[PDB]
Design a protein around this motif. Structure first.
Motif, short mmCIF file in Angstrom:
data_model
loop_
_atom_site.label_atom_id
_atom_site.label_comp_id
_atom_site.label_asym_id
_atom_site.label_seq_id
_atom_site.Cartn_x
_atom_site.Cartn_y
_atom_site.Cartn_z
N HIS F 111 31.80 39.98 35.17
CA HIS F 111 33.11 39.88 35.84
C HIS F 111 32.66 39.82 37.31
O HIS F 111 32.04 40.75 37.70
CB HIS F 111 34.24 40.86 35.43
N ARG F 113 34.78 40.95 39.44
CA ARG F 113 35.30 42.38 40.32
C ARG F 113 34.47 43.46 39.76
O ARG F 113 34.62 44.49 40.35
CB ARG F 113 36.83 42.49 39.79
N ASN F 114 33.56 43.28 38.86
CA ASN F 114 32.71 44.37 38.46
C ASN F 114 31.61 44.60 39.69
O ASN F 114 30.44 44.12 39.48
CB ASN F 114 32.08 44.03 37.18
N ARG F 115 32.02 45.46 40.53
CA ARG F 115 31.00 45.84 41.43
C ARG F 115 30.28 47.10 41.35
O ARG F 115 30.78 47.90 40.37
CB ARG F 115 31.84 45.83 42.69
N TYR F 118 30.54 49.70 46.45
CA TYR F 118 31.80 49.39 47.43
C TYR F 118 31.40 49.31 48.87
O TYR F 118 30.67 49.93 49.57
CB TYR F 118 32.83 50.48 47.14
N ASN G 63 32.59 48.23 34.30
CA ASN G 63 33.51 46.94 33.82
C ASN G 63 34.97 47.42 33.54
O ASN G 63 35.70 47.29 32.54
CB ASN G 63 33.09 46.84 32.31
N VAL G 64 35.49 47.86 34.96
CA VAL G 64 36.71 48.50 35.10
C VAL G 64 37.27 47.69 36.37
O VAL G 64 36.64 47.36 37.27
CB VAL G 64 36.89 49.87 35.20
N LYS G 65 38.66 47.67 36.62
CA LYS G 65 39.05 47.33 37.86
C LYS G 65 40.44 48.02 38.01
O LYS G 65 41.07 48.43 37.22
CB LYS G 65 39.69 45.63 37.60
N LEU G 75 37.46 45.06 31.70
CA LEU G 75 37.12 43.73 32.28
C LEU G 75 36.47 42.97 31.27
O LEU G 75 35.94 41.89 31.40
CB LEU G 75 36.38 43.97 33.57
#
Lengths: 61, 188, 283, 225, 98, 133, 116, 60
Positions: F111, F113-115, F118, G63-65, G75
């Motif tokens: 994904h 958004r899978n960072r 930060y 694997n989280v948002k 996710l």
RNA sequence: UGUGUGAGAAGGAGCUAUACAGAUACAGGCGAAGGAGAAGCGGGA
RNA sequence: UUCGUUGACUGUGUUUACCACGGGGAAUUAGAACAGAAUAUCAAAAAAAA
């Protein structure tokens, strides 16, 4: 974690299994870890995998 | 004693007359602005040229030359500072455990301020001598080497400095004048 | 020295957007927190005093003094400052070109620049002191030789000389003298910081001892009083074992009962990180 | 007094105070007093560049706009006017080699070196320095220090015979200082161990001290190649 | 070449060294200056002394305003020796100063 | 990354590419000239230098050129540096760092958004260098 | 005497409660778009002087948002996993991408709460 | 040294009527001492009267 | 694998429907650094 | 840097977090595909008489 961990391969991938003390005991944990290691030895999961291409220069990263 | 007093910094208006007068003058103000904006040339039209193409090339060449030479010159030194710096840390880390605290202090080290009520290694207060001053020790020789323009700029710098700090001596000699009670300060 | 009740002024107002009142926007959390985001404060809402002869007037004089001294001296000092902090060790000479016999002003600087792709325009922009902090920092520390002289020269009539003719061996002198005056201890701050922290010297683990001559054996004997090995160990390293009893009471007992067996809070905060000099490993 | 020199160097005469040891090595302190040149000199390129810039600026009318209302201020210090209107002991002296950086050196008996002094248990290094300066150099001698941290250190071990005394060796921590212009020279007291003193240049430095001693501080002195 | 501090001091760079030291400017975006009506293309190089008359002022230190040149942000000042061989051989004609 | 280091460090007859200030770690940026022609094996010289560096008591983190060129973008490299650093500086769970898992953005199916890292995120404002593994 | 009737007195009361907390246990198959943990952006005063647990939020793992209201959502297609942090004393939710298959009793160990 | 510690101040806040918790452990005090055996409520006036009687009986 | 949950005219000093076309969105980039001392300007990029 | 920009765009589809219903609306994924118009960032540069 205060845990006896044992490494092994599975599905052409490395992995490990832990053994916490708080579950079994001080003495029992080591016994269980060695027994599991023997099972992995018999199953042949300790052998490291390999990848070959057959062409000099070409490799896998 | 009074038993209740709290002072705060204050600048009397009478002591700052020079600065005030300099600033409020429009003729001087304009001049000041001019000095800040050295070129003061129009820069809002296509039909504007500071210098012809031939003039800029020589400037470029000179600049390049200057830089090229200076880098070469300076590198040699840089290596030396590097080398020297290498050793200081080594010696600091080699000191005993009890003497470590004194090896991590600045030249201007001083104790914290104590607000006492109304009626080691640190010996002397930090005071940089005037003798050691670059300008102090080489002003006479440099002064004679100064040019017309240089002298002019020096004069102007002196003037502006003086203007900025008129009461330097006043403060030094009578520091108490620059103090007012908190209640008087917070009600101006 | 001068002595007077300096007192303390009240805190300045920070301000905030006219939105949100029921909740608490003051949680004391790290910036950019993925769970506890920090409310933004637009700059335009911060109260500011009217511009006068005090606020603006003196800034003009400081800018005129800086213009007379020249921005090239400020850029050189900046360069030096930036360079000195990343070349603390002997380094191989570095060339700006792949070939030839040229040199560079600084290897660390060169590397840094080449890596970061720092804008050439932004280097020049800064030297003009667009902001108020750049003017205040020039007023406090404006001398060319400031690394050497501290703010001693902050009120010197004849200060432009330094900025005009201070090149060469003299320059080297400054660099040499500054290193012996820079700070090397620990930092204690609260506010957010976005920068590489300064180098901190490590502490040793081998304390000294005092000895005195003794003629009865023609030998140097330690001045410390003889004690039990246990005591010696205790005093030196600390308590032996994973745990020990609490500390004793110094002060006299309390005349009345007090529930001292209750913690400060039902839920203590997490432990804070360790900050201080590091141990020196055997070479 | 040779007794002080022997107590400084060797351990045969015991001192009147407790010594501070470190892994069998006694902590020591030194000092190096240096002087700045007296005559100003400038590079070649610097002049050229300056001249060129001035000329160019003048030619192109790009110079500073200096008004007559600012440059003509009536002040006591005023010395400015228009040019148009103008028409109406061979090694102990401090004045040796004006365009050079002179270093101080002392002579212990028959050996040229820097001053040395031991550290008293419980005392600071600055105190030691102070004492050193006030006893060996001169009573009224007080040079300006550059910092609290040292810049160099070395190790010196005793032979196999003197090791039975208890002290394995020595620990020296070199320090740097500056000479305040306008001050007088040194004045060796009657009860000091120093026999003589001299000021020498970087070039002539190696000719007095041994390489061993040279190397220990070669990386901390100024560059005058 | 140089081998000592004195030689460094009294160093005399050659014409090849000066040519290597020559400054060049590189464009970023394919923009058109709204002021001069001058088009720009990416990957192109030009002489700093002729790239833009107005920008030079600022670059040299004769302008306090950074906004003098709309396309100023689109500039990259580099040295001639830093440029690649390919680039050099391509824009060799446009970099000459005869 | 808020990490202090020295470039082109001199430690005698050996020259180190990057040397850390806070921790004993040396990052080696291997190039194509450090390997044979049409192969994936190091040379004797570099092997020897590695050996020596190890002996000296300094950890060595290798970085091959073909692995760096693949990570075209800075997002794929920022997390890789972190991971690499961790793998080297870890004291617990010692094992062979050969068959270790790897998952970086824009290369592996994941994904967006899978960072991991930060943007400007540091607990207690403590530098990465100082952070304890 | 007198008495002021509060605005929240009966019958005028809050019918919808802030159901804040975890919504998926360990070894629970999830797919993208499902909310793992619900949270609220509202923070009360004096947070450090309370006994309740709902005043503390969880941090994202793998694997989280994070949504607008600070909700943790999955996710990828996998199982929910929990983990503790020693450095912070805060739990972290982790998701392991896995395919749909029978859950054997010998694979339960894979979903154990560990400290990091 | 000895000191005359000031007594606490009454809290002007309405509180619940909850139960009285038990004691943690025995309290040891040198010299004579008087203790209760059961839990109950005691008023400030009661305590003050007890203090006055104790002072009058013992003396100054 | 261990969490959600304030009912009773119970207590408390809960309470405000509002802001932004941007130095309040905003790619990239930058960003606060002890104590003492100078200045008397409530200034981080 | 005193830096850019208007994406706060326009269409196709009926799969999903919670669930009396209503308002998917205290506010959940790239429904990871398809058809248009915008903005931002590139990448590479190894080998120095053994």
């Amino acid at each position: 974690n205060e845990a006896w961990e044992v490494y092994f391969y599975e599905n052409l991938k490395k992995s490990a299994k832990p053994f916490p003390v708080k579950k079994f005991g001080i003495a029992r944990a080591k016994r269980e870890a060695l027994l599991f290691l023997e099972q992995m030895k018999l199953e042949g999961k300790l052998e490291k995998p390999t990848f070959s291409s057959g062409v000099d220069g070409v490799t896998f990263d | 004693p009074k038993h209740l007093t709290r002072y705060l910094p204050f600048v009397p208006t009478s002591l700052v007359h020079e600065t005030t007068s300099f600033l409020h003058d429009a003729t001087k103000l304009r001049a000041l602005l001019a000095l800040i904006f050295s070129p003061c040339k129009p820069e809002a039209s296509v039909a504007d040229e500071l210098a012809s193409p031939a003039a800029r090339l020589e400037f470029q060449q000179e600049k390049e030359r200057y830089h090229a030479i200076r880098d070469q010159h300076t590198d040699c030194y840089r290596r030396h500072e590097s080398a020297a710096a290498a050793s200081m840390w080594r010696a600091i880390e080699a000191l005993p455990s009890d003497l470590y605290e004194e090896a991590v202090q600045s030249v201007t080290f001083a104790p914290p301020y104590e607000n006492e009520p109304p009626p080691g290694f640190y010996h002397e207060r930090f005071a940089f001598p005037r003798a050691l001053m670059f300008h102090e020790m080489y002003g006479e020789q440099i002064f004679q080497s100064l040019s017309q323009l240089e002298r002019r700029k020096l004069q102007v710098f002196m003037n502006l400095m003086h203007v900025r700090y008129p009461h330097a001596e006043l403060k030094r000699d009578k520091p108490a004048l620059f103090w007012l009670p908190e209640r008087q300060v917070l009600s101006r | 020295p001068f002595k007077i009740f300096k007192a303390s002024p009240p805190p300045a107002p920070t301000g905030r957007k006219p939105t949100g009142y029921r909740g608490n926007h003051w949680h004391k959390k790290v910036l950019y927190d993925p769970v506890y985001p920090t409310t933004k404060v637009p700059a335009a809402l911060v109260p500011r005093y009217p511009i006068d002869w005090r606020n603006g007037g003196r800034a003009l004089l400081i800018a005129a003094l800086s213009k007379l001294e020249g921005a090239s001296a400020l850029q050189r000092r900046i360069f030096l400052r930036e360079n000195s902090r990343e070349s603390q060790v002997p380094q191989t000479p570095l060339s700006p070109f792949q070939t030839g016999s040229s040199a560079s002003g600084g290897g660390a600087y060169l590397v840094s620049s080449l890596g970061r792709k720092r804008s050439y325009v932004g280097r020049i922009a800064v030297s003009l002191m667009p902001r108020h902090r750049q003017i205040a920092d020039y007023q406090r520390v404006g001398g060319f030789c400031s690394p050497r002289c501290f703010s001693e020269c902050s009120k010197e009539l004849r200060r432009c000389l330094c900025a005009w003719r201070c090149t060469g061996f003299h320059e080297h002198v400054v660099q040499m003298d500054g290193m012996l005056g820079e700070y090397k201890g620990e930092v204690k701050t609260e506010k957010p910081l976005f920068s590489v922290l300064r180098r901190q010297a490590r502490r040793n683990a081998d304390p000294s001892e005092g000895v005195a001559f003794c003629a009865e054996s023609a030998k140097f004997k330690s001045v410390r009083r003889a004690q039990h090995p246990a005591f010696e160990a205790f005093d030196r390293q600390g308590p032996d074992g994973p745990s020990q009893k609490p500390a004793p009471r110094k002060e006299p007992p309390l005349p009345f009962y007090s529930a001292s067996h209750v913690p400060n809070v039902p839920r203590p905060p997490p432990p804070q990180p360790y900050t201080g000099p590091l141990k020196v490993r055997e070479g | 007094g040779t007794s002080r020199r022997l107590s400084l160097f060797f351990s045969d005469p015991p001192p009147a105070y407790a010594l501070s040891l470190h892994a069998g090595y006694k902590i020591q302190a030194a000092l190096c007093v240096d002087r700045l040149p007296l005559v100003y000199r400038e590079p070649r390129y610097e002049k050229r560049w300056r001249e060129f810039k001035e000329q160019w600026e003048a030619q192109t009318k790009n110079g500073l706009t200096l008004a007559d209302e600012i440059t003509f201020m009536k002040f006591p210090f005023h010395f400015f006017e228009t040019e148009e209107a103008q028409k109406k002991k061979g090694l102990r002296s401090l004045e040796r080699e004006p365009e050079r950086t002179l270093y101080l050196i002392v002579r212990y008996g028959d050996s040229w070196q820097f001053p040395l002094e031991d550290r008293i248990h419980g005392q600071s290094m600055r105190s030691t320095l102070k004492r050193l300066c006030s006893e060996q150099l001169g009573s009224s001698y007080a040079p300006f220090l550059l910092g609290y941290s040292p810049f160099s250190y070395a190790k010196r071990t005793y032979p196999k015979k003197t090791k039975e005394a208890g002290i394995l060796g020595r620990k020296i921590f070199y320090y740097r200082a500056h000479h305040i212009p306008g001050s007088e020279n040194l004045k060796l007291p009657e009860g000091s161990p120093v026999s003589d003193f001299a000021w020498v240049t970087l070039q002539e430095l190696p000719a007095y001290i041994s390489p061993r001693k040279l190397a220990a501080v070669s990386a901390g002195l100024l560059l005058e190649e | 070449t140089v081998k000592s501090l004195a030689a460094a001091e009294q160093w005399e760079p050659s014409p090849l060294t000066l040519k290597q030291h020559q400054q060049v400017v590189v464009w970023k975006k394919d923009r058109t200056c709204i002021l001069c009506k001058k088009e720009v293309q990416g990957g192109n190089v030009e002489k700093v002394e002729t790239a833009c008359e107005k920008a030079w002022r600022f670059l040299s230190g004769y302008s306090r305003s950074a906004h003098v040149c709309p396309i100023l942000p689109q500039m990259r000042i580099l040295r001639y020796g830093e440029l690649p061989l390919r680039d050099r051989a391509k824009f060799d004609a446009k970099l000459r100063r005869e | 990354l808020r990490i202090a280091h020295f470039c082109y460090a001199i430690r005698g007859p050996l020259v180190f590419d990057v040397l850390e200030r806070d921790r004993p770690i040396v990052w080696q940026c291997n190039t194509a000239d450090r390997f044979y022609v049409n192969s994936a094996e190091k040379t004797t010289a570099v092997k020897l230098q590695e050996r020596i560096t190890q002996a000296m008591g300094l950890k060595v983190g290798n970085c091959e050129y073909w692995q760096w060129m693949k990570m075209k973008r800075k997002r794929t490299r920022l997390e890789y540096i972190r991971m690499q650093r961790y793998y080297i500086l870890k004291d617990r769970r010692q094992h062979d760092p050969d068959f270790e898992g790897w998952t970086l953005p824009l290369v592996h199916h994941m994904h967006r958004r899978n960072r991991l890292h930060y943007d400007y995120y540091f607990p207690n404002y403590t530098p990465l260098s100082r952070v304890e593994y | 005497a007198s008495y002021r009737r509060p605005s929240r007195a009966s019958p005028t009361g809050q019918a919808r409660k802030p159901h804040v907390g975890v919504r998926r246990l360990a070894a629970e198959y999830v797919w993208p778009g499902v909310v793992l943990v619900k949270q609220r952006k509202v923070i009360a005063f004096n947070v450090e002087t309370k006994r309740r647990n709902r005043h503390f939020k969880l941090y994202p793992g793998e694997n989280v948002k994070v949504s607008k209201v600070t909700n943790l959502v999955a996710l990828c297609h996998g199982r929910v996993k929990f983990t503790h942090d020693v450095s912070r004393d805060v739990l972290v939710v982790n998701v392991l991408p896995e395919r749909r298959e029978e859950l054997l009793r010998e694979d339960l160990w894979r979903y154990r709460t560990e400290h990091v | 040294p000895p000191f005359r510690f000031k007594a606490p101040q009454e809290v002007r806040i309405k509180v619940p009527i909850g139960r009285i918790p038990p004691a943690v452990g025995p309290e040891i005090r040198l010299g004579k001492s008087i203790v209760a055996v059961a839990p109950h409520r005691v008023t400030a006036e009661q305590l003050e009267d007890a203090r006055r009687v104790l002072r009058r009986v013992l003396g100054r």
